[PDB]
Short mmCIF file of C-alpha atoms in Angstrom, two decimals:
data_model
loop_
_atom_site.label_atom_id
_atom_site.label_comp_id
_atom_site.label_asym_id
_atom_site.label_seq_id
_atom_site.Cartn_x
_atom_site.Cartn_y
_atom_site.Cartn_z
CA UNK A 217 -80.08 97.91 -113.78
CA UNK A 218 -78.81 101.09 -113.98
CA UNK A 219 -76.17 103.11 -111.58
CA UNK A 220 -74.99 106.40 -111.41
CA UNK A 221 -71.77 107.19 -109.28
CA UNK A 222 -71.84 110.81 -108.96
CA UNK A 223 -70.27 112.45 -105.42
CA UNK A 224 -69.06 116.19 -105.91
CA UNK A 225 -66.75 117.86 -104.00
CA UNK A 226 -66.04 121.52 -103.66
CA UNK A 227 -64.42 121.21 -99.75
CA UNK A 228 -61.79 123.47 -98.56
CA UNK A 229 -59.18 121.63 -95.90
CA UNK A 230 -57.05 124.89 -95.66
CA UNK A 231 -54.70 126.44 -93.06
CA UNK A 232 -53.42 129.52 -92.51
CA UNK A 233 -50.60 130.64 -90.17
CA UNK A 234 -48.80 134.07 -89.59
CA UNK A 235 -45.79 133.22 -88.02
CA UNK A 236 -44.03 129.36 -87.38
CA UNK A 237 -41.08 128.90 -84.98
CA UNK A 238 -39.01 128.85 -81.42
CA UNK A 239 -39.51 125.51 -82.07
CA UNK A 240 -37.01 124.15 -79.67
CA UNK A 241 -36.70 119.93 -79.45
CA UNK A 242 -33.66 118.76 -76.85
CA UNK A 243 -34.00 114.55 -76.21
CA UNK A 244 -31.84 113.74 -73.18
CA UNK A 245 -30.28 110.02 -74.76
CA UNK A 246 -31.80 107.05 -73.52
CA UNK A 247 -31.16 103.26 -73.54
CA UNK A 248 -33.04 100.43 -75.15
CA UNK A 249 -32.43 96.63 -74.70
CA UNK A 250 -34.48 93.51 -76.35
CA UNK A 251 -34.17 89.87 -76.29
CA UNK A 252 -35.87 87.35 -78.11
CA UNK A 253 -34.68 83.73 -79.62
CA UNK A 254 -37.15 83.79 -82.60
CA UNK A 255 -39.16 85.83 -85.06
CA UNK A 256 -41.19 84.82 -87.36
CA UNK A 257 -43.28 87.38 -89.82
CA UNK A 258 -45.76 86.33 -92.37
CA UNK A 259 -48.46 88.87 -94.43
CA UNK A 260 -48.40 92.23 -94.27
CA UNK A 261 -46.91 92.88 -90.50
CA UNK A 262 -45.38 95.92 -89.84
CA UNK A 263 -42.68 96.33 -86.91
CA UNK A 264 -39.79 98.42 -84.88
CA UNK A 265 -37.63 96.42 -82.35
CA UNK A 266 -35.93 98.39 -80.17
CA UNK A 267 -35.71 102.03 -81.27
CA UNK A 268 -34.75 105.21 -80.22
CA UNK A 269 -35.87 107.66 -82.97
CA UNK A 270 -36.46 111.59 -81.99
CA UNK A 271 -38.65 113.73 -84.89
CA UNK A 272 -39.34 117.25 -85.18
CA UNK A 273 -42.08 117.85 -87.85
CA UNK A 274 -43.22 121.13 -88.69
CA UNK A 275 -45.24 121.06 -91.49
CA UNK A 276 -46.12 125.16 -92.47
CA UNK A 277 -49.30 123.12 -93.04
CA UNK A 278 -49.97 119.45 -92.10
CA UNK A 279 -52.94 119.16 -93.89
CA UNK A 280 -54.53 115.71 -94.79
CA UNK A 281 -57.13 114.65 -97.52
CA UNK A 282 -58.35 110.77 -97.62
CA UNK A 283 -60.83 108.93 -99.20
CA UNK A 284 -61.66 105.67 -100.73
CA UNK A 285 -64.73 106.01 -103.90
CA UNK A 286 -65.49 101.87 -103.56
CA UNK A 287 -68.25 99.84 -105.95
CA UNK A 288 -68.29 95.93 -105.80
CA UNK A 289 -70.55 93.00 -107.57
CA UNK B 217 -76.38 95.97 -117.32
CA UNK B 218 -75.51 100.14 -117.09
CA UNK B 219 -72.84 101.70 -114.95
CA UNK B 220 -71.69 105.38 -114.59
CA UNK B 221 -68.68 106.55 -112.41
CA UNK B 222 -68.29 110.51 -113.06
CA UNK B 223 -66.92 111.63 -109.48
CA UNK B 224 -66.24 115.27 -109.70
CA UNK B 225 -63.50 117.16 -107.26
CA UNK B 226 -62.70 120.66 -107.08
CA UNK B 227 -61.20 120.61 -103.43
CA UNK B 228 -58.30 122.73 -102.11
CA UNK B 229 -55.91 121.43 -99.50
CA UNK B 230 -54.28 124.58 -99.62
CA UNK B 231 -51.91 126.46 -97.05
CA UNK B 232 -50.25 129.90 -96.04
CA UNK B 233 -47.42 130.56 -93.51
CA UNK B 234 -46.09 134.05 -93.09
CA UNK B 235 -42.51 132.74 -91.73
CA UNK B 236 -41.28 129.49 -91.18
CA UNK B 237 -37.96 129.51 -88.63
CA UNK B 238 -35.47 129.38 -85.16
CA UNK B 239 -36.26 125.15 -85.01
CA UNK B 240 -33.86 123.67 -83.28
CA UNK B 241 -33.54 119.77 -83.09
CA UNK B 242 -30.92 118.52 -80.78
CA UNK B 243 -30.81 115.14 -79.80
CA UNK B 244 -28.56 113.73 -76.42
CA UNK B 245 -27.38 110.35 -77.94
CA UNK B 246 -28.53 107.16 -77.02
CA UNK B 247 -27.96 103.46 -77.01
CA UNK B 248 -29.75 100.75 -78.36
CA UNK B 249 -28.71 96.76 -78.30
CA UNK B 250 -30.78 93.80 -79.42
CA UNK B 251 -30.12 90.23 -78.82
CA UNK B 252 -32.00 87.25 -81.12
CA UNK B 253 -31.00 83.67 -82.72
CA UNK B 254 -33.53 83.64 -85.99
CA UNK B 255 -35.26 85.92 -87.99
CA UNK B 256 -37.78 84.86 -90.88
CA UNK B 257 -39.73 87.14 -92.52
CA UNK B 258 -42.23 86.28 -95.53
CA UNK B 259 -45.16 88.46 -97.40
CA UNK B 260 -45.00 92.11 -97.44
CA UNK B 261 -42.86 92.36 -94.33
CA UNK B 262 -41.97 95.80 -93.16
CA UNK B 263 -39.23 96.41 -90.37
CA UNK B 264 -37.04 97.78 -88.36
CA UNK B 265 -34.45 96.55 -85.80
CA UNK B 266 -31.88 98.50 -83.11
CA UNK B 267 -32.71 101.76 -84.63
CA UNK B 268 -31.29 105.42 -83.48
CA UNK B 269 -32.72 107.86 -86.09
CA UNK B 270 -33.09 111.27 -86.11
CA UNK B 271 -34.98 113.27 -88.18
CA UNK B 272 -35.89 117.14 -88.64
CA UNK B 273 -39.11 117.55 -91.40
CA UNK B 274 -40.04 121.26 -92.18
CA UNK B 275 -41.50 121.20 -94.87
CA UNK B 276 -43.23 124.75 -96.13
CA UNK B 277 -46.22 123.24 -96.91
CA UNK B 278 -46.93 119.14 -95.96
CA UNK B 279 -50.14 118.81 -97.61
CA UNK B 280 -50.94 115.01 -98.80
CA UNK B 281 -53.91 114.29 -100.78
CA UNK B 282 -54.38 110.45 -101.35
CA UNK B 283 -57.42 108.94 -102.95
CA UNK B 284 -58.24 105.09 -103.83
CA UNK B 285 -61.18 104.84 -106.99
CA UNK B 286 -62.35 101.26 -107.64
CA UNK B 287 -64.80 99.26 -109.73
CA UNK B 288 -64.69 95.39 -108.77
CA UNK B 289 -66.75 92.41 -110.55
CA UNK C 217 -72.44 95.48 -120.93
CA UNK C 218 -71.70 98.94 -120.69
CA UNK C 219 -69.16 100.70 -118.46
CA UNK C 220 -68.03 104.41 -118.10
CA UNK C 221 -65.27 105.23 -116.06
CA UNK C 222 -64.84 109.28 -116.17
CA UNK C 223 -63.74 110.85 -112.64
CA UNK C 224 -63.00 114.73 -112.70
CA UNK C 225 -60.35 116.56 -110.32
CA UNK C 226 -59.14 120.12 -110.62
CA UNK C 227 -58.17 120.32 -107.20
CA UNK C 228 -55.46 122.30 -105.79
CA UNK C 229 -52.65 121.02 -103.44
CA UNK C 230 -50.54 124.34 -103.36
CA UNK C 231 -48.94 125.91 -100.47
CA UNK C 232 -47.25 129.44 -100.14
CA UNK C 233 -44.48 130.18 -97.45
CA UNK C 234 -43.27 133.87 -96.85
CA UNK C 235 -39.71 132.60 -95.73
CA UNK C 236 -38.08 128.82 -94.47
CA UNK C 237 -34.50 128.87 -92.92
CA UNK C 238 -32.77 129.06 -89.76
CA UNK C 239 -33.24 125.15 -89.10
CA UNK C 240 -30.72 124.04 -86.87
CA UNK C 241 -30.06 119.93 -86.72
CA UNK C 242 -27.72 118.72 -84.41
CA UNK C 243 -27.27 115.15 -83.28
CA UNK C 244 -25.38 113.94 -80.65
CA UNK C 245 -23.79 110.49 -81.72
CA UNK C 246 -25.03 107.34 -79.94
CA UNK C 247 -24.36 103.17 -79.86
CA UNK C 248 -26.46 100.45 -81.43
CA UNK C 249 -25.61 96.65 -81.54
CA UNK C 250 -27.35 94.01 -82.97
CA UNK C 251 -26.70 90.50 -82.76
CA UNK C 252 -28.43 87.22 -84.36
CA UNK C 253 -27.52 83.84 -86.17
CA UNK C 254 -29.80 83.65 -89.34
CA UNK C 255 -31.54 86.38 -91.22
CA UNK C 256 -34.25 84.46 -94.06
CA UNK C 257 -36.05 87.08 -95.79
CA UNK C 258 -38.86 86.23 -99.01
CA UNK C 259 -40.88 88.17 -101.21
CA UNK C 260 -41.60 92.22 -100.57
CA UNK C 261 -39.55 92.43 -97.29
CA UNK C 262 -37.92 96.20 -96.46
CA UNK C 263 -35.51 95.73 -93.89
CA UNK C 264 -33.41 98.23 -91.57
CA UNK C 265 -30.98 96.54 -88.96
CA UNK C 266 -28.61 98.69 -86.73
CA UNK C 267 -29.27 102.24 -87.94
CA UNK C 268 -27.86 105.49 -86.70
CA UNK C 269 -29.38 107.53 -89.03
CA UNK C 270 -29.82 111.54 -89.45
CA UNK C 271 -32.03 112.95 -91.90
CA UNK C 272 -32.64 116.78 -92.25
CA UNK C 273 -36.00 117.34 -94.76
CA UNK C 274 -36.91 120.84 -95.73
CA UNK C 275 -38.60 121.10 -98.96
CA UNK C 276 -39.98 124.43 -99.67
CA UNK C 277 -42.62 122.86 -100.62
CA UNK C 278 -43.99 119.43 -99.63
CA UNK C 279 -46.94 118.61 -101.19
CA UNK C 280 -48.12 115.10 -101.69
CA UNK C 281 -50.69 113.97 -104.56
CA UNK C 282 -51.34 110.13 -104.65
CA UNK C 283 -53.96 108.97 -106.97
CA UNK C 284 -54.91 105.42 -107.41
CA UNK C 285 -57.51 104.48 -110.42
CA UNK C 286 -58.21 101.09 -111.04
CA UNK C 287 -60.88 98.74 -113.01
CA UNK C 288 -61.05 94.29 -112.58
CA UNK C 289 -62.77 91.40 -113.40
CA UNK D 217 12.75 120.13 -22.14
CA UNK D 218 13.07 116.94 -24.48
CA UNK D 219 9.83 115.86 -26.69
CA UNK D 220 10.06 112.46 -28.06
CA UNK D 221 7.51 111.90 -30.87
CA UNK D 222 7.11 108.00 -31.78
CA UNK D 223 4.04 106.51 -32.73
CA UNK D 224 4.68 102.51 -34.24
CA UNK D 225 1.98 101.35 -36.62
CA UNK D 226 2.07 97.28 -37.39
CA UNK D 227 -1.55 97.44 -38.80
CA UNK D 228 -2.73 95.76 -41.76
CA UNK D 229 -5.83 97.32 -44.01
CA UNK D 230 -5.78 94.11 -45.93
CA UNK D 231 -8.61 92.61 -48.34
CA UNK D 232 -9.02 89.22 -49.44
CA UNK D 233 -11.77 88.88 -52.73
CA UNK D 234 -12.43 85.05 -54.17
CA UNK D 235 -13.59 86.77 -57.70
CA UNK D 236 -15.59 89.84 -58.61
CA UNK D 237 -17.67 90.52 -61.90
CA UNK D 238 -20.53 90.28 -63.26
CA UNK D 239 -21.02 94.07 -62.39
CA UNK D 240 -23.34 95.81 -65.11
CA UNK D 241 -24.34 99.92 -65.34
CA UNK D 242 -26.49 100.87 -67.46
CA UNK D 243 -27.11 104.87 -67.19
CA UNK D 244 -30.34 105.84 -68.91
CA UNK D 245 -29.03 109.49 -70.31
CA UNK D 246 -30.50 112.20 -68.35
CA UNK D 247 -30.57 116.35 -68.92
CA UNK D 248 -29.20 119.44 -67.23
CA UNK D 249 -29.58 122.96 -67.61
CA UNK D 250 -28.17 125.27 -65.33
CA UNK D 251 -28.50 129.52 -65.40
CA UNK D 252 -26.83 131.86 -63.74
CA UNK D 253 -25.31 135.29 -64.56
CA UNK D 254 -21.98 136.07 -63.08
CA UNK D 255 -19.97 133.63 -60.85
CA UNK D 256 -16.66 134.60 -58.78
CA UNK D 257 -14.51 132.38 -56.89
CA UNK D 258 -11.42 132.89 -54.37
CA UNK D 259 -9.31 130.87 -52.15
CA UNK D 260 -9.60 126.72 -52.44
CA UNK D 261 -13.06 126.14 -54.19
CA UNK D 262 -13.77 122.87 -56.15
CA UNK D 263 -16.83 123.08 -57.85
CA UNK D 264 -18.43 121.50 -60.28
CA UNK D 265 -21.38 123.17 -62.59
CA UNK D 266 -23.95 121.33 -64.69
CA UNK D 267 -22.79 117.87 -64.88
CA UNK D 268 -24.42 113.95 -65.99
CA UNK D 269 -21.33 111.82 -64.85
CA UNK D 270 -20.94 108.46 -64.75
CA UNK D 271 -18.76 106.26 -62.95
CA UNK D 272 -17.74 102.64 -62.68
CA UNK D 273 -15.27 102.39 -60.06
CA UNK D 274 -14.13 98.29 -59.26
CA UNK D 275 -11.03 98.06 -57.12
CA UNK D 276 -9.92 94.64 -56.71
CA UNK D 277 -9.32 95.99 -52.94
CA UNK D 278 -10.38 99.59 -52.60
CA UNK D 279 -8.16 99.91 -49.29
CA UNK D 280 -7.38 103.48 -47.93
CA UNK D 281 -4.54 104.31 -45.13
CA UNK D 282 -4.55 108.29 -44.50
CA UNK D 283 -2.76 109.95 -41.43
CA UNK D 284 -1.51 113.30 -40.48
CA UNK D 285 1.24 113.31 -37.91
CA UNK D 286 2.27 116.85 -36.48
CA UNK D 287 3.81 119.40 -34.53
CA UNK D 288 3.59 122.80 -33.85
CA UNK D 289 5.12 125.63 -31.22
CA UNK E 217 16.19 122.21 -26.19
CA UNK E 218 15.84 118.85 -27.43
CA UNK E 219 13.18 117.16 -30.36
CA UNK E 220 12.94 113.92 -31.49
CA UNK E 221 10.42 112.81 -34.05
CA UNK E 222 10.49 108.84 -34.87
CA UNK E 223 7.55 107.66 -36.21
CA UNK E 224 7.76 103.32 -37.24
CA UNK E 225 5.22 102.48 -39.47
CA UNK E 226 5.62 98.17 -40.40
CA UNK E 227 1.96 98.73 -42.24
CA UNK E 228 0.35 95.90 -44.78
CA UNK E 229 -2.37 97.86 -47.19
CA UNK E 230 -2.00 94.62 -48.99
CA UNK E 231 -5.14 93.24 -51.38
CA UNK E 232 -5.45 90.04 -52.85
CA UNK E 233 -8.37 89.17 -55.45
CA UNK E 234 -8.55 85.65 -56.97
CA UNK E 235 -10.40 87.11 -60.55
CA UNK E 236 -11.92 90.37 -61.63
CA UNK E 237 -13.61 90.99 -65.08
CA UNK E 238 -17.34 90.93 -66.65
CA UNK E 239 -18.01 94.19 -66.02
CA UNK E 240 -20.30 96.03 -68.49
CA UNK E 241 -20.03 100.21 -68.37
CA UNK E 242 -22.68 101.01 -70.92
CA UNK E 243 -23.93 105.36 -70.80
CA UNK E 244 -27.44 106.15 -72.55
CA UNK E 245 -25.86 109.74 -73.70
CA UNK E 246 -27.21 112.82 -72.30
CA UNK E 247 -27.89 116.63 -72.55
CA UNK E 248 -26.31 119.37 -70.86
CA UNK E 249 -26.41 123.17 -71.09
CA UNK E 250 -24.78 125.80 -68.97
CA UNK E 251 -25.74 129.49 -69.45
CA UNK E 252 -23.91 132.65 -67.46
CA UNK E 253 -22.26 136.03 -68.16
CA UNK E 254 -18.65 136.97 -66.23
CA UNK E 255 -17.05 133.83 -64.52
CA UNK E 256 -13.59 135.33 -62.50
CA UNK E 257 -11.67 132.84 -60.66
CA UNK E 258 -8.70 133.76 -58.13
CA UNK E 259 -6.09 131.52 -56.05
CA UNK E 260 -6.83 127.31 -56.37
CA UNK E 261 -9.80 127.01 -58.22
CA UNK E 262 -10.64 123.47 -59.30
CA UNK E 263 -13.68 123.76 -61.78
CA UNK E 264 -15.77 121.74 -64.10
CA UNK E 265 -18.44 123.46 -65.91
CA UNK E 266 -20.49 121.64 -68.85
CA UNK E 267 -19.53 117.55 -68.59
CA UNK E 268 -20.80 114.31 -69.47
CA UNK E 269 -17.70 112.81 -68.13
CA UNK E 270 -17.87 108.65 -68.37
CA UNK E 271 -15.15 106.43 -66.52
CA UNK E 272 -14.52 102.87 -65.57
CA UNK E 273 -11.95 102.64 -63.61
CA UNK E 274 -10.64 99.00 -62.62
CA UNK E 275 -7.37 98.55 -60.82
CA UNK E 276 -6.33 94.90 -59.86
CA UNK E 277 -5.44 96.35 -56.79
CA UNK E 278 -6.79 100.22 -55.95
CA UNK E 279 -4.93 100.68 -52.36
CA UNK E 280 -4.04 104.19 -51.14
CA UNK E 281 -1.40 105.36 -48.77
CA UNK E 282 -1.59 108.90 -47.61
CA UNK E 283 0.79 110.87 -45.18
CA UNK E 284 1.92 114.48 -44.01
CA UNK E 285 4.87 114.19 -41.45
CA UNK E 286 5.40 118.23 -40.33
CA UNK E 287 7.29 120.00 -37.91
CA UNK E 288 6.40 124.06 -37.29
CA UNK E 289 8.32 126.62 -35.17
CA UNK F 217 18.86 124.48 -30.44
CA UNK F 218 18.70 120.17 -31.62
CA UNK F 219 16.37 118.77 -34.18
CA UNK F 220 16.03 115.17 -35.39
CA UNK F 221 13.92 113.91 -37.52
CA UNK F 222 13.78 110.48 -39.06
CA UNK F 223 10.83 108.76 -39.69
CA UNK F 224 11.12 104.87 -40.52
CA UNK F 225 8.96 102.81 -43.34
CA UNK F 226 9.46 99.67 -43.75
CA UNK F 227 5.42 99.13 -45.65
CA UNK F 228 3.83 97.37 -48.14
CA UNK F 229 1.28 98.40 -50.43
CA UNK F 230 1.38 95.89 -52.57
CA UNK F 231 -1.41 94.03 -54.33
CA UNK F 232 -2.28 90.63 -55.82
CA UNK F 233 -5.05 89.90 -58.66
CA UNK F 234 -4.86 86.43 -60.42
CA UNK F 235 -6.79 87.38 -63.40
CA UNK F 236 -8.17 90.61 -64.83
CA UNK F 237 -9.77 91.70 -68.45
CA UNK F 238 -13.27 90.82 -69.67
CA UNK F 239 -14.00 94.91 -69.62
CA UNK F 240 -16.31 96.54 -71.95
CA UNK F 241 -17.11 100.21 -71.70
CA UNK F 242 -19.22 101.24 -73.98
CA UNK F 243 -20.76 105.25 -73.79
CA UNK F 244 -23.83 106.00 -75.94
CA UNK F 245 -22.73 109.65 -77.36
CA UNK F 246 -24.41 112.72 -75.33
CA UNK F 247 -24.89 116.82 -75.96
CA UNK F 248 -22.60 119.65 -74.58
CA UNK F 249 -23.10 123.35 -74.81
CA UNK F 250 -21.62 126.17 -72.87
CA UNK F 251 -22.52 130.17 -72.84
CA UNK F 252 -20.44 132.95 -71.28
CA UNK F 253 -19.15 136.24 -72.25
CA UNK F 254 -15.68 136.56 -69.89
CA UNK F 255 -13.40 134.40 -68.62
CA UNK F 256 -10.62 135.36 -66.09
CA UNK F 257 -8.66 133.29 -64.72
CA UNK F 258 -5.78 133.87 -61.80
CA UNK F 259 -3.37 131.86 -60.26
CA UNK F 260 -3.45 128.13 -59.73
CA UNK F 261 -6.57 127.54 -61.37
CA UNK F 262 -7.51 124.36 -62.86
CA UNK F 263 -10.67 124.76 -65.29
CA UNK F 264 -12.39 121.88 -67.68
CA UNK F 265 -15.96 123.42 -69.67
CA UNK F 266 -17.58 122.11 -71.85
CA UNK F 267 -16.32 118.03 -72.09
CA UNK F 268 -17.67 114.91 -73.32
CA UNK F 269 -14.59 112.63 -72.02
CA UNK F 270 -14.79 108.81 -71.88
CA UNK F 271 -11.52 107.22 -69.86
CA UNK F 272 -11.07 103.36 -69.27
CA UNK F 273 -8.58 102.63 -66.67
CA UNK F 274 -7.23 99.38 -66.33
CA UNK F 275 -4.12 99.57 -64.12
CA UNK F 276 -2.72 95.98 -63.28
CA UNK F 277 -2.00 97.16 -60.35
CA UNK F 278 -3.01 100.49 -59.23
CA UNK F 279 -1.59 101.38 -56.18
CA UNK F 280 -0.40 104.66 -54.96
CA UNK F 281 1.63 105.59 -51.94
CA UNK F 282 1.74 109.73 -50.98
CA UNK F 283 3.93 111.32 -48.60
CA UNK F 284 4.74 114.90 -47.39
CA UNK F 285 7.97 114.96 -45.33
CA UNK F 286 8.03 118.92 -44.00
CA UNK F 287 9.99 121.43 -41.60
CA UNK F 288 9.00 124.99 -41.00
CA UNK F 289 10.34 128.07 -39.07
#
């Protein structure tokens, strides 16, 4: 046995943008209600309960690189 | 037994904006209400509850690069 | 047994921006209530509970780099 | 000439309630935007412009007795 | 000549109510906006431009009496 | 020339609650803006722009008794 782990990677993800704005974001309230008697949250969960978040997100570039480089036995 | 791991990267996640202006994030209020007895929460729990949150992000570049490298016997 | 662990990067994550500003953030209040008997919380658990919160994020630069590198047995 | 003006009123406008509640409203925000460019009023006008009112109104008796009594020559 | 102006009013605008409560007034927010140039107002104007008026209004007894008695020559 | 005038009131506008409270209001915030250039204003105006008013009114008893008693020549 031999292995050679050898990806290359010369990739360009760019953006380019002359002019960003008038960017106008006006929420108009709201109203939210949530009942429960019990919760109960084991391993890894992830939660919202009754929310009422506004976002503005202007990223001049929102640009996004992943990856997972894996070996197992 | 033999193992290699040279992965090579030369990447660009690069970005250009000219101008970056006039946002305008207004939000209207809100309500939120939440009714329960018991909460338990065990293991890597992540939450929120009744929640009103506002948030403006503009940042001038937002590039993310995220990489996971792993061997494993 | 023999093991070589030798990854290369010379990657860029840069941004330019020719001007950021005239952000305008402006909440409007709201109401949030939260009721409950028993909160039991073990091990890793982040926890929000009635939030009203306002966040204004403008980094002139954003970038994000997240590198994990890991070897196990 | 003689005129003799003389109505008699013995009326009753009553209200008779054994218990009121339980009365929930629960306005879910809203939005308004109104334009115009020049506005001119004379002479007895109410008016109202642009407007998200709201109004609980829960007389315990919500009775109304109005008259006009006149003359004229 | 000869006027006579007697009016007899006895009148009962009389309410009776045994209990009054649980009531809940509970807004979501909201968003307005009024845009204009000249306003000119002359001679009993009643205005209201731009609200997000809330009441509750809850009198134990609410009853109106309303009169003009006139004479004109 | 003979006038006489003389109205008679002997009424009752009187009410009767046994028990009043248990009252929440509760508004969830909101957004006001207003634009203009001039305002002018002439006699007997009455003007509100640009509010964000929350009343609770809780009167007892809340009763109201109006009268205009008028001669003219």
């Amino acid at each position: 046995v031999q292995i050679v782990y050898k990806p290359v990677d010369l990739s360009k993800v760019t953006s380019k943008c002359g002019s960003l704005g008038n960017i106008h974001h006006k929420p108009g309230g709201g109203q939210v209600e949530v009942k429960s008697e019990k919760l109960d949250f084991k391993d890894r969960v992830q939660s919202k309960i009754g929310s009422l978040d506004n976002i503005t997100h202007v990223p001049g570039g929102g640009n996004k690189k992943i990856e997972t480089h894996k070996l197992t036995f």
